[PDB]
Amino acid sequence: MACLSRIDANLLQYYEKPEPNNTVDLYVSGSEYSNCLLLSNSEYICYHFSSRSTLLTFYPLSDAYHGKTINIHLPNASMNQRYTLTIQEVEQQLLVNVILKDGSFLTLQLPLSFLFSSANTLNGEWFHLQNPYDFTVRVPHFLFYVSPQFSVVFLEDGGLLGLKKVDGVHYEPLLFNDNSYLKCLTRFFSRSSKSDYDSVISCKLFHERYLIVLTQNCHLKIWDLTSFTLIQDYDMVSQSDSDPSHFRKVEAVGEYLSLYNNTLVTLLPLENGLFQMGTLLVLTYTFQNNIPTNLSASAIWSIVDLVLTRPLELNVEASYLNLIVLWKSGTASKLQILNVNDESFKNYEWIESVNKSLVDLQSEHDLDIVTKTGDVERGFCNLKSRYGTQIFERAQQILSENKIIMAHNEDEEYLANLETILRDVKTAFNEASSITLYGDEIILVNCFQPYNHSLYKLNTTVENWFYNMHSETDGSELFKYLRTLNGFASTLSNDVLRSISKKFLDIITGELPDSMTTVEKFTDIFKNCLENQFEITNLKILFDELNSFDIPVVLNDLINNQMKPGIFWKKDFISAIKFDGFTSIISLESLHQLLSIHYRITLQVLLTFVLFDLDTEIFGQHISTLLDLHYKQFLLLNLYRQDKCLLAEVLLKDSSEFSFGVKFFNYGQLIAYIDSLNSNVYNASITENSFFMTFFRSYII
Ligand SMILES: [Hg+2]
Ligand SMILES: [Hg+2]
Ligand SMILES: [Hg+2]
Structure with a gap:
């Protein structure tokens, strides 16, 4: 549709x-x-x-x-x-x-x-x-x-x-x-x-x-x-x-x-x-x-x-x-x-x-698992970062003008207002x-x-599946596979999904000891995160639908064709001679949509591996590739909301010959460049080469 x-x-x-x-x-x-x-x-x-x-x-x-x-x-x-x-x-x-x-x-x-x-x-x-x-x-x-x-x-x-x-x-x-x-x-x-x-x-x-x-x-x-x-x-x-x-x-x-x-x-x-x-x-x-x-x-x-x-x-x-x-x-x-x-x-x-952006839809439908929670000022940085100064300040204007002033540091009653105004000012700005x-x-x-x-x-293909879960009458095996995976994951709650994502990060960071067996960590994650947290009825539905799939074949296409991009013999991404602010943000936002979508898919797939008895040895490759992709996905999504400008900067100063930006004229060029930036994200190294790097990451992630 x-x-x-x-x-x-x-x-x-x-x-x-x-x-x-x-x-x-x-x-x-x-x-x-x-x-x-x-x-x-x-x-x-x-x-x-x-x-x-x-x-x-x-x-x-x-x-x-x-x-x-x-x-x-x-x-x-x-x-x-x-x-x-x-x-x-x-x-x-x-x-x-x-x-x-x-x-x-x-x-x-x-x-x-x-x-x-x-x-x-x-x-x-x-x-x-x-x-x-x-x-x-x-x-x-x-x-x-x-x-x-x-x-x-x-x-x-x-x-x-x-x-x-x-x-x-x-x-x-x-x-x-x-x-x-x-x-x-x-x-x-x-x-x-x-x-x-x-x-x-x-x-x-x-x-x-x-x-x-x-x-x-x-x-x-x-x-x-x-x-x-x-x-x-x-x-x-x-x-x-x-x-x-x-x-x-x-x-x-x-x-x-x-x-x-x-x-x-x-x-x-x-x-x-x-x-x-x-x-x-x-x-x-x-x-x-x-x-x-x-x-x-x-x-x-x-x-x-x-x-x-x-x-x-x-x-x-x-x-x-x-x-x-x-x-x-x-x-x-x-x-x-x-x-x-x-x-x-x-x-x-x-x-x-x-007709609404992913960032907007996730906010509306409480589908955002990445944004940090907690403090009231934390929720201030979140919104300020999310909306941008022009809008944020226009919303704080409409607040005072209406005599809505912040009582103390923790006036949650206030922040609750900002939410709605920001949303409306954006909607207005966006007519x-x-x-x-x-x-x-x-x-x-x-x-x-x-x-x-x-x-x-x-x-792109994957995006279409994402944006049409509740519609594609037909669709490929992978589409049907993802849909039934979403069918089950959607019944869980945000706090549960977040706790699970965190556990997958612990596997990569080591908080879940490398000494443990894959089956042990999935066992740990289950008992601490999933047990008593879902309807056994829905697991049956999931278990059943799953059996109609040649899982290895499907995951292979998902992980080796759809998600993991490809090598570039430089497929012309008009190298910009001067900084193009427009394409810059258009690229970053696009990159953020694709990775957000990848992130949900990845988490959902990983989820099935900790629930069912899939040979941790057969799927050992896939499991570790997913846990690695998940970590990078998280991190990127995390840096995106922590500081958009800085991200765009390190991300565009990553590519040598394209150190100023790009110029795309058709959709193919655009998609290509985005898929391109995706590779830079999936090929990036995530090993901390000293206590300095470990501190950095722990403090930020
Ligand atoms: Hg479509
Ligand atoms: Hg618009
Ligand atoms: Hg910037």
Whole structure:
């Protein structure tokens, strides 16, 4: 069911200061919208339009901390939020146009250099206010770029203004012919009506000439800018079952369509479930099929952004095109990928993904065995480390503001609050805003709170089993084997599992004397940890299911194919010339998910060995390989939550030729690099070469 997982990235996580030191504020005489644009230098720039549409913010995706974020203040809000705003890169510059509320037409010119410089000053004219047309009468609501000098304006009443640049700073309104207003001669529409309007809600420029548009009544009017004449006028709805009942005339500009080559998909309102996709050809738009959506619980999701593109590397080869869809329902999000098999838009499959990160799911479902327990300040370090300074401090802000102050060092009552706020602030910071296709195929989501992004990563085999235990109808032997192993381990409690994990570490550390026989240690672990701690009924279920497996074969594939990665004859992981903060955290978080998953599997398998009579001699190899993998897994997970920055540092300064970071462009490269870091973790030495190293480990582990 779910083929992608969520990796949350907070670009300032590794730092104490929850804000770059280099922040410049330009004034003219972001939690409502955010997106990422690629530039000439192959760098990614992020921008956020504040809630009030009065502030625009810029910062580099790959260097959020040391890089410069630029806050561009504005005289007043734009007319209609980010819809009356545009940002394209002309020639070595970020050209920003923004029809303001008053009716002005601000023009921002930000030098590509300035964006990556150290400069806290800007020379010349980076902005030009202008009053082309009078918007006091016919108020506009949607600005649309087309070219450096030409771009249209969409009006609330339905009219399309033109806007041609003559010199390099002045714009003149080149009006298009419009007779759609004559429908007022009907007893069904009045020009003076607050309704009746059929304004554009989506628009896409095709072959630099045709301007495909979508009205609130889902009419696909196609404009030819060579004629400035309405060339087509299709009625998207008539084709599907004509429901007299109710058709939700789109009541707001949104992302209802996007086109790849000559294919075009459209989102029609039918319980919020229609994705029509025909093809343009010559100009002619021609139907193909209506693909419903698989949404339930009333179907209360709103489209956030959709992106039609070249296929991906999903679990089904039968692919032609891919539609990445981002829905939202409050601060909760949903990302899916519509995979169309053949050129006939009639055979397709809906691919879903996990919408909470593993770190989030483990916290929610009390599935975390690694994080140290105890003290109240211990729980403070845990959260602070877990959330990052930007969020932690924002939560301690909301606490005092609400008069929730820490009584004493051990005010557990307090910490209990922090938990919930942190969780909520994160959820808030994480509200979905748009999609950015990082590289060639990396699905990325940009959040409401600046410096927070979410990468949706294609799952590896093992990950898929993990994320689909309660679903895979079919699945391989190993899948079925792991599932039944989980079936039993899930019935135990955290305190029991932790006590067991600790015992496995003692075998490696020696607290469980090397003098003992394997059977003796497993005996010790059982009596001290498992006895009287589980339902004998469940052991039977486990014992039974286990007998249907060729255990040796299965464990061999798990331990020698799935878990233990492979040797590298350097399989190209673009060596980064400069520190890439984005991929850094994306890599560390990904590495942490994979090892966490490995850790649960490993523990579960080890568990069966201390419960049943498996020849400690036959499986002697496997048992010691698992105990060794478990130890490394634990340690790594332990260092991850003890100090993310330091870990990333020692972990990236471990690889020689990749001492600065990496640059991955597709999912394969990404997965490869992660699997790569995994090897560094499984091949690392864990022998303490002196009392110094032993102290270190004892003190930390
Ligand atoms: Hg799957
Ligand atoms: Hg997000
Ligand atoms: Hg770091």
